[PDB]
Design a protein around this ligand. Structure first.
Ligand code: FMN
Ligand code: FMN
Lengths: 122, 122
């Protein structure tokens, strides 16, 4: 499951980055630390407004990478830390995963990331 | 050259993300908003400590993507904004580009991104 420090980062606002495999190279989109909803410590839910290219990419290769951090949380060499998350992505338009982000009216779906690994990179 | 709102984002701390193309798939690493230096309005310089897999990917394909933002800066439709930057990357161990981040004594090199396009995505 995700470590306590990961949740500490989530107590602070920040920019989350999500990389996927495009056909002409990688693609990169974002979300906010404050938007992420974690289910039972091993699945991360992201509210999807756009992410059309991203969804197309996931349909071809479900592997995704996600990073996030906060200068307000202690890392391993002083103030500031973050994580590199590797996992498989899936889009849902119903179910408890969607309900987790349904609060966001502009959300057309939920991007569900099943975490395989989490590395504190700083 | 880079827009006004982009430079505003740079004055607030945050997590910058850099995506590259790996032989296996995409790769994603980070730096801090406060570490970025812009030279001549179209070249973003990043202090490199690690970024080894990143450097290897750039050697195979110089095209990279960078995202960054801040909740403290006015967005298109509300508080909070960010950008998707597309450009070509090069690692420098000397020259004015390296000197641009020499302040960081731990920097083994400078990752210079010559911006092709910048898009306010939020
Ligand atoms: C700081 C920041 C936060 C964002 N948060 C979201 C979000 O929660 N949901 C979303 O669909 N797009 C969000 N976006 C926009 C995406 O990054 C992306 O530009 C957009 O969804 C289009 O995705 P696509 O390029 O995969 O089609 C955000 C952008 C920024 C800069
Ligand atoms: C919030 C945050 C900021 C980071 N800033 C830097 C940085 O300025 N320079 C750097 O070389 N690595 C930085 N890292 C570590 C990189 O993201 C990456 O893990 C490391 O350089 C190894 O790169 P590689 O996976 O390409 O080999 C940061 C990590 C986090 C979570």
């Amino acid at each position: 499951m995700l470590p306590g420090t990961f949740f500490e980062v989530l107590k602070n606002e920040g920019v989350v980055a999500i990389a996927t495999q495009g056909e002409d190279g990688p693609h990169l989109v974002n979300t906010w630390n404050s938007y992420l909803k974690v289910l039972d410590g091993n699945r991360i839910v992201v509210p999807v407004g756009g992410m059309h290219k991203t969804e197309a990419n996931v349909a071809r290769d479900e592997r995704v990478l996600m990073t996030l951090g906060s200068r307000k949380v202690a890392g391993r060499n002083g103030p500031g830390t973050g994580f590199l998350i590797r996992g498989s992505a899936a889009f849902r338009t119903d179910g408890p995963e969607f309900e987790a982000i349904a609060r966001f009216k502009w959300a057309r779906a939920a991007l569900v990331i099943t975490v395989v690994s989490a590395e504190q990179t700083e």
